[PDB]
Design an enzyme around this catalytic site. Structure first.
Site, PDB file in Angstrom:
ATOM      1  N   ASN A 196       0.856  -1.194   0.000  1.00 27.23           N
ATOM      2  CA  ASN A 196       0.000   0.000   0.000  1.00 27.23           C
ATOM      3  C   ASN A 196       0.885   1.233   0.000  1.00 27.23           C
ATOM      4  OD1 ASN A 196      -2.312   1.440  -0.214  1.00 27.23           O
ATOM      5  ND2 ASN A 196      -3.325   0.429   1.546  1.00 27.23           N
ATOM      6  N   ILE A 198       1.697   8.220   5.723  1.00 25.22           N
ATOM      7  CA  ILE A 198       1.512   9.372   4.787  1.00 25.22           C
ATOM      8  C   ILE A 198       1.749  10.667   5.579  1.00 25.22           C
ATOM      9  CG2 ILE A 198      -0.157  10.699   3.437  1.00 25.22           C
ATOM     10  CD1 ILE A 198      -1.457   7.996   2.670  1.00 25.22           C
ATOM     11  N   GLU A 234       5.341  -2.569  12.433  1.00 31.22           N
ATOM     12  CA  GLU A 234       6.393  -2.069  13.358  1.00 31.22           C
ATOM     13  C   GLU A 234       7.434  -1.343  12.516  1.00 31.22           C
ATOM     14  OE1 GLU A 234       8.336  -5.018  16.091  1.00 31.22           O
ATOM     15  OE2 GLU A 234       9.751  -3.424  16.672  1.00 31.22           O
ATOM     16  N   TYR A 238      -4.630  15.215  -9.328  1.00 33.51           N
ATOM     17  CA  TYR A 238      -5.144  15.655  -8.008  1.00 33.51           C
ATOM     18  C   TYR A 238      -6.328  16.590  -8.253  1.00 33.51           C
ATOM     19  CZ  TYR A 238      -1.795  13.258  -4.914  1.00 33.51           C
ATOM     20  OH  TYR A 238      -1.133  12.322  -4.169  1.00 33.51           O
ATOM     21  N   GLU A 276      10.301   3.461  -8.282  1.00 30.86           N
ATOM     22  CA  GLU A 276       9.037   3.617  -9.025  1.00 30.86           C
ATOM     23  C   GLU A 276       9.040   5.025  -9.610  1.00 30.86           C
ATOM     24  OE1 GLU A 276       4.702   2.450  -8.179  1.00 30.86           O
ATOM     25  OE2 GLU A 276       5.326   3.719  -6.519  1.00 30.86           O
ATOM     26  N   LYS A 293       7.951   0.932   1.218  1.00 31.41           N
ATOM     27  CA  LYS A 293       8.613   0.219   0.091  1.00 31.41           C
ATOM     28  C   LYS A 293       9.896   0.948  -0.268  1.00 31.41           C
ATOM     29  CE  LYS A 293       5.061   0.510  -2.616  1.00 31.41           C
ATOM     30  NZ  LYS A 293       4.342   1.281  -1.569  1.00 31.41           N
ATOM     31  N   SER A 294       9.831   2.265  -0.427  1.00 30.77           N
ATOM     32  CA  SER A 294      11.000   3.076  -0.832  1.00 30.77           C
ATOM     33  C   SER A 294      12.057   2.960   0.268  1.00 30.77           C
ATOM     34  CB  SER A 294      10.604   4.501  -1.037  1.00 30.77           C
ATOM     35  OG  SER A 294      11.719   5.204  -1.485  1.00 30.77           O
ATOM     36  N   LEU A 350       3.574  11.085   8.486  1.00 26.54           N
ATOM     37  CA  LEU A 350       5.062  11.098   8.665  1.00 26.54           C
ATOM     38  C   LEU A 350       5.773  11.643   7.421  1.00 26.54           C
ATOM     39  CD1 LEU A 350       6.210   7.970  10.678  1.00 26.54           C
ATOM     40  CD2 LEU A 350       5.260  10.167  11.425  1.00 26.54           C
ATOM     41  N   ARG A 402       7.387  -1.826  -6.898  1.00 23.61           N
ATOM     42  CA  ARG A 402       6.094  -2.162  -7.533  1.00 23.61           C
ATOM     43  C   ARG A 402       6.375  -2.690  -8.929  1.00 23.61           C
ATOM     44  NH1 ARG A 402       2.942   2.606  -5.146  1.00 23.61           N
ATOM     45  NH2 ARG A 402       1.736   1.664  -3.434  1.00 23.61           N
ATOM     46  N   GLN A 409      -2.050   6.857 -15.942  1.00 29.92           N
ATOM     47  CA  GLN A 409      -1.764   5.407 -15.811  1.00 29.92           C
ATOM     48  C   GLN A 409      -0.883   4.928 -16.967  1.00 29.92           C
ATOM     49  OE1 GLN A 409      -2.415   3.331 -13.171  1.00 29.92           O
ATOM     50  NE2 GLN A 409      -2.496   5.451 -12.427  1.00 29.92           N
TER      51      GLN A 409
HETATM   52  C1  LIG Z   1      -0.834   8.885  -3.274  1.00 31.09           C
HETATM   53  C2  LIG Z   1      -1.926   8.488  -4.255  1.00 31.09           C
HETATM   54  C3  LIG Z   1      -1.713   9.202  -5.566  1.00 31.09           C
HETATM   55  N1  LIG Z   1      -2.751   8.887  -6.561  1.00 31.09           N
HETATM   56  C4  LIG Z   1      -2.665   7.882  -7.415  1.00 31.09           C
HETATM   57  N2  LIG Z   1      -1.560   7.221  -7.617  1.00 31.09           N
HETATM   58  C5  LIG Z   1      -1.784   6.214  -8.552  1.00 31.09           C
HETATM   59  C6  LIG Z   1      -0.691   5.362  -8.948  1.00 31.09           C
HETATM   60  N3  LIG Z   1      -0.772   4.685 -10.094  1.00 31.09           N
HETATM   61  C7  LIG Z   1       0.270   3.927 -10.452  1.00 31.09           C
HETATM   62  N4  LIG Z   1       0.161   3.205 -11.568  1.00 31.09           N
HETATM   63  C8  LIG Z   1       1.398   3.844  -9.660  1.00 31.09           C
HETATM   64  C9  LIG Z   1       1.412   4.615  -8.519  1.00 31.09           C
HETATM   65  N5  LIG Z   1       2.464   4.633  -7.703  1.00 31.09           N
HETATM   66  N6  LIG Z   1       0.366   5.345  -8.153  1.00 31.09           N
HETATM   67  C10 LIG Z   1      -3.046   6.161  -9.060  1.00 31.09           C
HETATM   68  S1  LIG Z   1      -4.013   7.434  -8.414  1.00 31.09           S
HETATM   69  C11 LIG Z   1      -3.875   9.742  -6.623  1.00 31.09           C
HETATM   70  C12 LIG Z   1      -5.067   9.329  -6.052  1.00 31.09           C
HETATM   71  C13 LIG Z   1      -6.196  10.136  -6.142  1.00 31.09           C
HETATM   72  C14 LIG Z   1      -7.447   9.695  -5.489  1.00 31.09           C
HETATM   73  C15 LIG Z   1      -7.433   9.313  -4.157  1.00 31.09           C
HETATM   74  C16 LIG Z   1      -8.577   8.871  -3.530  1.00 31.09           C
HETATM   75  C17 LIG Z   1      -9.759   8.796  -4.237  1.00 31.09           C
HETATM   76  S2  LIG Z   1     -11.201   8.256  -3.378  1.00 31.09           S
HETATM   77  O1  LIG Z   1     -11.523   6.936  -3.818  1.00 31.09           O
HETATM   78  O2  LIG Z   1     -10.984   8.568  -2.004  1.00 31.09           O
HETATM   79  N7  LIG Z   1     -12.426   9.219  -3.888  1.00 31.09           N
HETATM   80  C18 LIG Z   1     -13.701   8.596  -4.290  1.00 31.09           C
HETATM   81  C19 LIG Z   1     -14.420   9.542  -5.227  1.00 31.09           C
HETATM   82  N8  LIG Z   1     -14.650  10.841  -4.590  1.00 31.09           N
HETATM   83  C20 LIG Z   1     -15.377  11.746  -5.487  1.00 31.09           C
HETATM   84  C21 LIG Z   1     -13.383  11.434  -4.146  1.00 31.09           C
HETATM   85  C22 LIG Z   1     -12.620  10.514  -3.208  1.00 31.09           C
HETATM   86  C23 LIG Z   1      -9.805   9.194  -5.591  1.00 31.09           C
HETATM   87  O3  LIG Z   1     -11.011   9.128  -6.236  1.00 31.09           O
HETATM   88  C24 LIG Z   1     -11.062   9.177  -7.666  1.00 31.09           C
HETATM   89  C25 LIG Z   1      -8.642   9.627  -6.200  1.00 31.09           C
HETATM   90  C26 LIG Z   1      -6.105  11.347  -6.811  1.00 31.09           C
HETATM   91  C27 LIG Z   1      -4.910  11.767  -7.357  1.00 31.09           C
HETATM   92  C28 LIG Z   1      -3.777  10.960  -7.286  1.00 31.09           C
HETATM   93  C29 LIG Z   1      -2.520  11.385  -7.937  1.00 31.09           C
HETATM   94  O1  LIG Z   2       9.554   1.520   9.140  1.00 30.88           O
HETATM   95  C1  LIG Z   2       9.258   2.632   8.675  1.00 30.88           C
HETATM   96  C2  LIG Z   2       8.820   2.713   7.355  1.00 30.88           C
HETATM   97  C3  LIG Z   2       8.492   3.965   6.855  1.00 30.88           C
HETATM   98  N1  LIG Z   2       8.575   5.061   7.644  1.00 30.88           N
HETATM   99  C4  LIG Z   2       8.202   6.345   7.099  1.00 30.88           C
HETATM  100  O2  LIG Z   2       6.906   6.157   6.487  1.00 30.88           O
HETATM  101  C5  LIG Z   2       6.857   6.989   5.322  1.00 30.88           C
HETATM  102  C6  LIG Z   2       6.519   6.135   4.112  1.00 30.88           C
HETATM  103  O3  LIG Z   2       7.571   5.242   3.730  1.00 30.88           O
HETATM  104  P1  LIG Z   2       7.984   5.141   2.178  1.00 30.88           P
HETATM  105  O4  LIG Z   2       8.063   6.443   1.626  1.00 30.88           O
HETATM  106  O5  LIG Z   2       9.148   4.163   2.117  1.00 30.88           O
HETATM  107  O6  LIG Z   2       6.620   4.396   1.689  1.00 30.88           O
HETATM  108  P2  LIG Z   2       6.268   3.811   0.216  1.00 30.88           P
HETATM  109  O7  LIG Z   2       5.217   4.791  -0.266  1.00 30.88           O
HETATM  110  O8  LIG Z   2       7.573   3.901  -0.575  1.00 30.88           O
HETATM  111  O9  LIG Z   2       5.677   2.430   0.538  1.00 30.88           O
HETATM  112  C7  LIG Z   2       8.214   7.674   5.199  1.00 30.88           C
HETATM  113  O10 LIG Z   2       8.063   8.964   5.749  1.00 30.88           O
HETATM  114  C8  LIG Z   2       9.154   6.810   6.013  1.00 30.88           C
HETATM  115  O11 LIG Z   2      10.320   7.496   6.480  1.00 30.88           O
HETATM  116  C9  LIG Z   2       9.000   4.934   8.970  1.00 30.88           C
HETATM  117  O12 LIG Z   2       9.095   5.938   9.687  1.00 30.88           O
HETATM  118  N2  LIG Z   2       9.339   3.731   9.428  1.00 30.88           N
END
Ligand SMILES: CCCN(c1nc(-c2nc(N)cc(N)n2)cs1)c1cc(-c2ccc(S(=O)(=O)N3CCN(C)CC3)c(OC)c2)ccc1C
Ligand SMILES: O=c1ccn([C@@H]2O[C@H](COP(=O)(O)OP(=O)(O)O)[C@@H](O)[C@H]2O)c(=O)[nH]1
Ligand SMILES: CCCN(c1nc(-c2nc(N)cc(N)n2)cs1)c1cc(-c2ccc(S(=O)(=O)N3CCN(C)CC3)c(OC)c2)ccc1C
Ligand SMILES: O=c1ccn([C@@H]2O[C@H](COP(=O)(O)OP(=O)(O)O)[C@@H](O)[C@H]2O)c(=O)[nH]1
Ligand code: NA
Ligand code: NA
Lengths: 228, 228
Positions: B10, B157, B208, B56, B34, B15-16, B159, B98, B67
């Site tokens: 998640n 998130i 942990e 966003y 990634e 992961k990073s 943190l 990933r 995507q």
């Molecule tokens: C940190 C997440 C960033 N993020 C994303 N990343 C990825 C991604 N794709 C990869 N192939 C690799 C990879 N690493 N990441 C895909 S999308 C992202 C997510 C949302 C987003 C969050 C939540 C909801 S919801 O289901 O809560 N929602 C229900 C509907 N209502 C109206 C609003 C609330 C969402 O809904 C549409 C969109 C918006 C932007 C962004 C960049």
């Molecule tokens: O054992 C851990 C693992 C992660 N983090 C913190 O949790 C956040 C998310 O970790 P990362 O960015 O590696 O998550 P990813 O999105 O890459 O899974 C970062 O601020 C890390 O420094 C932490 O404090 N302890």
């Protein structure tokens, strides 16, 4: 080794007509019809017809999606023919209806120029295209440019009779014509594909109807092919 | 022969963090960060930051574009490492942050499920993915699943502190968690990649904090690797 020749030209220049003439004239000659052309008449055809109709409604929403799928569809279809066909042929020639270059340098470029793609969509598209290509076996031995005036092409859109195309304005055709002249006649057009600068080009004037009278055009094709 | 291992988990599971621990522990161990993660901190980084910010603002406009570019960016970066690195290594291992599978079965799938992609965009995306992949050298020897609760990930998130992520709701994390459990724990998730059903999976609980205390996790990685 299969010779790859692209047939290039404006909308309704007569590429599909010409390619369907060529395919019947030799067992050594095969054609890859253009995916977009097939979508204008399977899961890709279902996707393609939806994205084409959506493009007609809102080009600034759908241009990136349409262009990526059109080009992917083309690469898949060209690679399939290259790997599938002409295995027993003496002088195998595969005629492409347009190319990955017309996708990018004619259509996608014009959609960017019309602000139907923003800069990010256009830069992602070119990055995708540069990558999707530079992975190779589709490089052209030659291009045949079916050169028709915009007015010829406008008249031929009316002849073909697809409802969605009847609103296409002359100005659009003139823009695409200018692009084809820059690319294939003047060779002023700079691409990211160095070999294209030196690829042989046969330009055929197709302003005169050729459906019943194409022997002179085919003679020029056979001469051009013998030079490659 | 380079062993390819995906690190899956998640958002903010660690992961990073984990991958940056692993890379330092052996000259035979390399990592592919990634692309999306790099865009959250070149022409791809410029494209990526624009498309992330636009996502966003309007996920239903930008999900297909995001995507496709995220997955293309990943394939390019994974192929580059596979072809570039670990040439002199005794037991070479390349850890992916990933995979193309998480792109499609976690993120893209969830965006389709939220109606951020329509059916045509989702079917084009899967067609593109099926094709873009089934051309091969990226197939995984194993997956390491960093399993954290949604609440752990929500806390992480906070943190990490990226402004745009602070509004991410728990419900989103729970949805992605459910998907990861279906795919990697229960193996109920049906993919279009037959070999994935039989790929070995190491699940590590990372609820942990492990940044200063990871030796037991690495021991489990070294044991898992010896079995492949
Ligand atoms: C940190 C997440 C960033 N993020 C994303 N990343 C990825 C991604 N794709 C990869 N192939 C690799 C990879 N690493 N990441 C895909 S999308 C992202 C997510 C949302 C987003 C969050 C939540 C909801 S919801 O289901 O809560 N929602 C229900 C509907 N209502 C109206 C609003 C609330 C969402 O809904 C549409 C969109 C918006 C932007 C962004 C960049
Ligand atoms: O054992 C851990 C693992 C992660 N983090 C913190 O949790 C956040 C998310 O970790 P990362 O960015 O590696 O998550 P990813 O999105 O890459 O899974 C970062 O601020 C890390 O420094 C932490 O404090 N302890
Ligand atoms: C028969 C043409 C179909 N057509 C297209 N096909 C391709 C294409 N791409 C391939 N990679 C291969 C391949 N074979 N074809 C790309 S787009 C298409 C074109 C328009 C369109 C027409 C004209 C104008 S404009 O410049 O006249 N315009 C100025 C602005 N104002 C406001 C409106 C008028 C246009 O503008 C945005 C869009 C709309 C939909 C569609 C499907
Ligand atoms: O010499 C010709 C070439 C074409 N056409 C007609 O012009 C239209 C466009 O041709 P085609 O579909 O081959 O054009 P493309 O878009 O494939 O260049 C069709 O109705 C053809 O039957 C014609 O009557 N005579
Ligand atoms: Na033939
Ligand atoms: Na290392």
């Amino acid at each position: 080794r299969i010779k790859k020749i692209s047939i290039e030209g404006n909308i309704a220049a007569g590429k599909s007509t010409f390619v369907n003439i060529l395919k019947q004239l030799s067992e050594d000659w095969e054609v890859v019809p253009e995916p977009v052309a097939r979508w204008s008449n399977t899961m890709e055809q279902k996707n393609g017809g939806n994205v084409l109709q959506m493009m007609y409604e809102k080009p600034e929403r759908w241009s990136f999606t349409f262009q990526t799928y059109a080009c992917l569809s083309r690469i898949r279809a060209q690679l399939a023919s290259l790997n599938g066909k002409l295995k027993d042929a003496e002088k195998p020639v595969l005629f492409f209806e347009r190319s990955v270059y017309s996708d990018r340098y004619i259509f996608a470029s014009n959609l960017y120029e019309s602000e139907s793609m923003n800069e990010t969509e256009w830069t992602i598209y070119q990055d995708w295209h540069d990558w999707m290509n530079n992975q190779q076996s589709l490089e052209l031995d030659g291009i045949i440019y079916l050169q028709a005036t915009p007015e010829t092409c406008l008249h031929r859109i009316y002849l073909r009779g697809r409802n969605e195309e009847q609103g296409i304005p002359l100005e659009y055709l003139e823009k695409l014509h200018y692009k084809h002249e820059s690319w294939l006649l003047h060779r002023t057009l700079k691409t990211n594909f160095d070999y294209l600068q030196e690829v042989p080009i046969l330009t055929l004037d197709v302003n005169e109807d050729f459906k019943d009278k194409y022997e002179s055009l085919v003679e020029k094709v056979k001469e051009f092919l013998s030079t490659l």
